[PDB]
């Protein structure tokens, strides 16, 4: 495009008070509306979230699984 | 090709759109009413105009009824407005007159009454062949 030699009308970054107030009002209305939709949401939600686990690149993941196994066996023996 | 001829020097245009000129050949028409000029430019409010040797679009108002309901290409061969040639001579004819041709420039009729202008004679070789006086 011929932007460098012949630039067009600039896009103003100077906000107006009316537009700022309107944007704030619409943001607050959207936030209240999404609260209402989340309240009346029929979409299913699990009781317990899926835990991502231990990353593979952690250098002591196998050892950490060893204490996990040992602690569960100890809990089974205690119970 | 359009009817505008090349190699034509600038001259005074004496016949604007709306003029009625005599019909100088034997096609059957008695006069031609100019509705358009070939090669006319574009200006606001300006009437198109033609001079001697120009092709115009003309309508027969008096003549045979067979020629009546059509638009014909015509060539202006005589004009009454004085115009200057390159040798410094201003000149004019006693009437405005033209001949009906086809878009390629062959004449509809067979003979021309009265003289024709030089500019018409060089620009249209059929009119030069059908003219008895070149003047």
């Amino acid at each position: 495009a011929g932007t460098i030699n012949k630039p067009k009308k600039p896009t103003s970054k100077r906000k107006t008070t009316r537009l700022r107030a309107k944007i704030s009002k619409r943001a607050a209305e959207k936030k209240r509306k999404e609260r209402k939709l989340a309240r009346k949401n029929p979409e299913w939600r699990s009781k317990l979230k899926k835990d991502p686990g231990i990353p593979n690149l952690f250098p002591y993941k196998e050892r950490l699984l060893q204490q996990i196994e040992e602690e569960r066996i100890r809990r089974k023996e205690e119970l | 090709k359009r009817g505008a001829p090349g190699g034509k020097l600038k001259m005074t245009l004496g016949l604007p759109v709306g003029a009625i000129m005599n019909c100088a050949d034997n096609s059957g028409a008695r006069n031609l009413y100019i509705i358009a000029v070939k090669g006319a430019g574009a200006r606001l409010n300006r009437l198109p105009a033609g001079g001697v040797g120009d092709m115009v679009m003309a309508t027969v108002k008096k003549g045979k009824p067979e020629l009546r309901k059509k638009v014909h290409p015509a060539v202006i061969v005589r004009q009454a407005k004085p115009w200057k040639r390159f040798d410094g001579v201003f000149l004019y004819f006693e009437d405005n007159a033209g001949v009906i041709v086809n878009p390629k420039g062959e004449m509809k009729g067979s003979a021309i009454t009265g003289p024709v202008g030089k500019e018409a004679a060089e620009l249209w070789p059929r009119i030069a062949s059908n003219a008895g006086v070149v003047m």
């Binding site: - | 309508t59 309901k69 059509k70 638009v71 014909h72 290409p73």
Partner: protein, 50 residues
């Protein structure tokens, strides 16, 4: 449309209004006669002003 004409066309046999050689010759005869009659009626039936 794609199997009739084009890069993927599969049509080989045309649709003919005749079956034999004599029918072809006759059909060409009345075809030319009808074409001439249509030209004659079209002829019987500088631009014009608006």
């Amino acid at each position: 449309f794609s199997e009739t004409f084009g890069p993927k066309a599969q049509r080989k046999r045309p649709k003919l209004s005749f079956n034999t050689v004599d029918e072809l010759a006759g059909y060409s005869e009345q075809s030319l006669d009808s074409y001439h009659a249509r030209l004659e009626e079209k002829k019987l039936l500088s631009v014009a002003t608006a």
